[PDB]
Antibody
Framework: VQLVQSGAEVKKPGSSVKVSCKSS????????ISWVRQAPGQGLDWMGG????????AYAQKFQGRVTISADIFSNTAYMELNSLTSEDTAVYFC??????????????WGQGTTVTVSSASTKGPSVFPLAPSSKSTSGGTAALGCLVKDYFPEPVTVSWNSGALTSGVHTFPAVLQSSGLYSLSSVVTVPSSSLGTQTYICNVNHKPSNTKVDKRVEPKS | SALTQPPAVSGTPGQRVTISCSGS????????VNWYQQFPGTAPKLLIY???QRPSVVPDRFSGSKSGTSASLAISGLQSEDEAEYYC???????????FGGGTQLTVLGQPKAAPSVTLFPPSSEELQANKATLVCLISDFYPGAVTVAWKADSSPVKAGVETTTPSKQSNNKYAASSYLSLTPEQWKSHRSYSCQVTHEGSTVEKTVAPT
């Protein structure tokens, strides 16, 4: 048996989110189901549970009056609806099935998780800035070249170097979500310093949600 | 969290490790303990239930016990692949709800410690020209996977405008993270230098950049 959850969600502050959990490979109605969330870098947090056989639902105190857990007994799907969303609600939401009718039992089958992002931002392509070294190129020596992919929404953006020809020394870092509600990330390629006099380095940034493709030439300056 | 676990634990392959879970009379005192294991960017998996019972698919080197209002997970013969996050959980009778521990990051040193490689970039001229400024601090190839980042304007701590990512596993099995400091082009120019300081296993790597 597998628990399958609905896809990632982006929501505005004050709005509601409804995450779905289906048991594929037969009914999960005879067992308790819990919703557990995990805010980035934080631990597991129980939101509440439902046990349809008893027609009972329970909620963590901290979410009482804000979350509604339900089960469509006919379709074999459980749901979690969270209202009045703020940025503190940005997290991965898991459904998980207990081993029996009760919330005390181990949760032995977990859904894959659903990322919910709460942001007042709308779709926006990144500004891209070149990041150049000036004492890195010593002596020598390798040098770190980068491109800053600033203030985009929503995820995700892809980055390559020299239209894909350059893979050695590339590290693209995971995005930060800033308190503004927009993302930024950076890609760096480490190159031999000597190559900076003969080779051109260009970062190619593609942001599909906004149909933005940007090419930036990165080149130590002055 | 109503249940208390040590946030970080380390072990060497072949060695035994124990992760404790401290609870109260309303939860661990009265109810059975469950243990979950979670790898980065994926769902937890059930490891132990009913205090000491193991799912078929769990290696028998994993075991649990319950001691009054406390519970413990033991792993014998630590393998490199046990490097994960571990959570204990119990129903709580007073709360009428399930409670988890805060989690334990278990480090299995099947490789040497590595200090973070730190790359600090000043604002690009392009960004400064359009009247903005961002300091970018890139932190890679460190192991174990926790660091803390502190920013300095000259010799004094900056707190505001700092956005730091959580760490993430690389292909080569070490970790990376980044931290951003956003500022006005005037704040940037008024200081002789800014510094990104990254402390890893009680030792700091720093980099420094200047408006020159």
């Amino acid at each position: 048996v597998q628990l399958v959850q609905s896809g990632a969600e982006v929501k505005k502050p004050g709005s509601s989110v409804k995450v779905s959990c289906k048991s594929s490979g037969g009914t999960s109605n005879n067992y308790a189901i819990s919703w557990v969330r995990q805010a980035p870098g934080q631990g597991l947090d129980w939101m509440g549970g439902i046990s349809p056989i008893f027609g009972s639902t329970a909620y963590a105190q901290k979410f009482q009056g804000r979350v509604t857990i339900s089960a469509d007994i006919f379709s074999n799907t459980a749901y979690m609806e969270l209202n009045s969303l703020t940025s503190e609600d940005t997290a991965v939401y898991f459904c998980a099935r207990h081993g029996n009718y009760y919330y005390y039992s181990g949760m032995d089958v977990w859904g894959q998780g659903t990322t919910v992002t709460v942001s007042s931002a709308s779709t926006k392509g990144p500004s891209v800035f070149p990041l150049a070294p000036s004492s890195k190129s010593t002596s020598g020596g390798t040098a770190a070249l980068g491109c800053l992919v600033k203030d985009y929404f929503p995820e995700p953006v892809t980055v390559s170097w020299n239209s894909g020809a350059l893979t050695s020394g590339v590290h693209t870092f995971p995005a930060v979500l800033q308190s503004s509600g927009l993302y930024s990330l950076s890609s760096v390629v480490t190159v031999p310093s000597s190559s900076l006099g003969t080779q051109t380095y260009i970062c190619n940034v593609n942001h599909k949600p906004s149909n933005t493709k940007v090419d930036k030439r990165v080149e130590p300056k002055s | 969290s109503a249940l208390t676990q040590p946030p970080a634990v380390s072990g060497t392959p072949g060695q035994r490790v124990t992760i404790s879970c401290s609870g109260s009379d309303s939860n661990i005192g009265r109810r059975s303990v469950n243990w979950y294991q979670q790898f980065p960017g994926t769902a937890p998996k059930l490891l132990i239930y009913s205090n000491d019972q193991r799912p078929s698919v769990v290696p028998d080197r994993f075991s649990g016990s319950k001691s009054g209002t406390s519970a413990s997970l033991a792993i014998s013969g630590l393998q490199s692949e046990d490097e994960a996050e571990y959570y204990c959980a119990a129903w709580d009778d007073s709360l009428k709800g399930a409670v988890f521990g805060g989690g334990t990051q278990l480090t299995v040193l099947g490789q040497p410690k590595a200090a973070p490689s730190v790359t600090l970039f000043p604002p690009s001229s392009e960004e400064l020209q359009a009247n903005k400024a961002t300091l970018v601090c890139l932190i890679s190839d460190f192991y174990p996977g926790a660091v803390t980042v502190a920013w300095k304007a000259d010799s004094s701590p900056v707190k505001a405008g700092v956005e730091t990512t959580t760490p993430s596993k690389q292909s080569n099995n070490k970790y990376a993270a980044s931290s951003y400091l956003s500022l006005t082009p005037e704040q940037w120019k008024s200081h002789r230098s800014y510094s990104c300081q990254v402390t890893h296993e009680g030792s700091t790597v720093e980099k420094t950049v200047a408006p020159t």
